[PDB]
Design a protein around this ligand. Structure first.
Ligand code: HEM
Ligand SMILES: c1ccc2[nH]ncc2c1
Length: 462
């Protein structure tokens, strides 16, 4: 007994029920019609969508092992079943677990804060270097989290002007962008009919292969000078783990597997944080009054010169709330990443067969209209008690939750606080249009929500 849903058509299933430019909106439309759990056929493939905190929470937390699979994403077939993001195989569990331990060992530790704090040095330099002229913040702000993850992964630090640096960011940006477009949405559910026609899916595929090749080469480089006594980074810690298991019959790690793990952490480690920061700057420019309040709190708690520290969050409730509100407001990965039933499952009273794609929607949660009155409006007080202290919400789920929760959550959240603190400590944001004319709406919705392209100026405070 499948969850209720619209009557599918031959070949295309439910494609008339879906607006490809705005799948999250189609999902919301379908939840009004059929309730919090529903069935869809997108092409021949069956999915069940959960919509709203209760349904999304049950799916991700009560049936953790049942939905701990990962739905196929054809554009990233080069990663499928290797690493962590795109694998629905036996190898997922211990590669994930090991990566998380290594990530954590590399930073509570204060290695993460320090690492972020020292990148803020280079980020702040680049912004001063624009000397108050208009600039596209895309490939400037983006260097910050990209270097931070490069330190952990490769022991590698890049100049902001360096050629392969800018190119890797370009490809990350292009992929996140194109994956959020309607042609790619159609491609991921009809890959066999469409794969060999021309179109943007081919750019994504080429792009994925280029990043993988760049990673691959850094990995083999790491092999050729690996000191098993003295691992330099996460890429090393994975090499060490592969060669402890030389004699083993069953292999957890391959050289292909590790490059995928690294290519994963490199892409995810860079793109979502950069997009978040970039969106956050555009929002703060739409509400001059919010930036002002931020400036006074930074001047009061930290002052004009002392490098922001994580221990400042407790004492900066307005900043803390704004940072949460940026992530809640932009719903950056608004349908989550797709899950799948590892087993024939009984959810509520419905059968969800093995290998049904399961979509525990995140925007439906982050935009709950009772948890967050006026959820469509940007409001720091969505995360502030009436007496002005930071207010926690169980609805703040932008990193998802459960078995497949974002592997970089700790890092990302630290980065957003400390980098946004740093930027506002030293700079005023200057929009090139009137704050009233700024349209905050995503220009593409799919895999992510993509901000409009814009230029701005930053005007030094110190
Ligand atoms: C603002 C920044 C970020 C946001 C909004 C974000 C969001 C997400 C979401 C929604 C998922 C899917 C979870 C699920 O399937 O239930 C995910 C997974 C993942 N993230 Fe993030 N993320 C961010 C930053 C990062 C960073 C910095 C890293 C690198 C350490 C990272 C690495 C990963 C990996 C490897 C996965 C796949 C988890 C798995 O499939 O087992 N992410 N993220
Ligand atoms: C793709 C791009 C950015 C990401 N952050 N977390 C998972 C992820 C995947």
């Amino acid at each position: 007994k499948l969850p209720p849903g619209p009557f599918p058509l031959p070949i295309i299933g439910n494609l008339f029920q879906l607006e490809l430019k705005n799948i999250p909106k189609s999902f919301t439309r379908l939840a009004q019609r059929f309730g919090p759990v529903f069935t869809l056929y997108v092409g021949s493939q069956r999915m069940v969508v959960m919509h709203g905190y209760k349904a999304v929470k049950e799916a991700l937390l009560d049936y953790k092992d049942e939905f701990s699979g990962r739905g196929d994403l054809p554009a990233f077939h080069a990663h499928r079943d290797r690493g962590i993001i795109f694998n629905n195989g036996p190898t997922w569990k211990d590669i994930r677990r090991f990566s998380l331990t290594t990530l954590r060992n590399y930073g509570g530790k204060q290695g993460n804060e320090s690492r972020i704090q020292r990148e803020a040095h280079f980020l702040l330099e680049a912004l001063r270097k624009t000397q108050g002229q208009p600039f596209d913040p895309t490939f400037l702000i983006g260097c910050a989290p990209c270097n931070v993850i490069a330190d952990i992964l490769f022991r590698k630090h890049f100049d902001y002007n360096d050629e392969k640096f800018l190119r890797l960011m370009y490809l990350f940006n292009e992929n996140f962008h194109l994956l959020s477009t309607p042609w790619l949405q159609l491609y991921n559910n009809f890959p066999s009919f469409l794969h060999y026609l021309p179109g943007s899916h081919r750019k994504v595929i080429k792009n994925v292969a280029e990043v993988k090749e760049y990673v691959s080469e850094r990995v083999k480089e790491h092999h050729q000078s690996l000191d098993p006594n003295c691992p330099r980074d996460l890429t090393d810690c994975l090499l060490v783990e592969m060669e402890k298991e030389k004699h083993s019959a069953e292999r957890l790690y391959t050289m292909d597997g590790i490059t995928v793990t690294v290519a994963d952490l490199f892409f995810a480690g860079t793109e979502t944080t950069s997009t978040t920061l970039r969106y956050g700057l555009l929002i703060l420019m739409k509400y001059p009054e919010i930036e002002e309040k931020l400036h006074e709190e930074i001047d009061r708690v930290i002052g004009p010169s002392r490098i922001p520290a994580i221990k400042d969050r407790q004492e900066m409730p307005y900043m803390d709330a704004v940072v949460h509100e940026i992530q809640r407001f932009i719903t950056l990965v608004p349908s989550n990443l797709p899950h799948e039933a590892t087993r024939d499952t009984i959810f509520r009273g419905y059968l969800i067969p093995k290998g049904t794609v399961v979509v525990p929607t995140l925007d439906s949660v982050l935009y709950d209209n009772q948890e967050f009155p006026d959820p469509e409006k940007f409001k720091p007080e969505h995360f502030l008690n009436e007496n002005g202290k930071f207010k926690y919400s169980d609805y703040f789920k932008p990193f998802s939750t459960g078995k497949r929760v974002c592997a970089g959550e700790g890092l990302a959240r630290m980065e957003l606080f400390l980098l946004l603190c740093a930027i506002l400590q030293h700079f005023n944001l200057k929009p090139l249009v009137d704050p009233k004319d700024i349209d905050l709406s995503p220009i593409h919705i799919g895999f992510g929500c993509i901000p409009p392209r814009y230029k701005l100026c930053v005007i030094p405070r110190s």
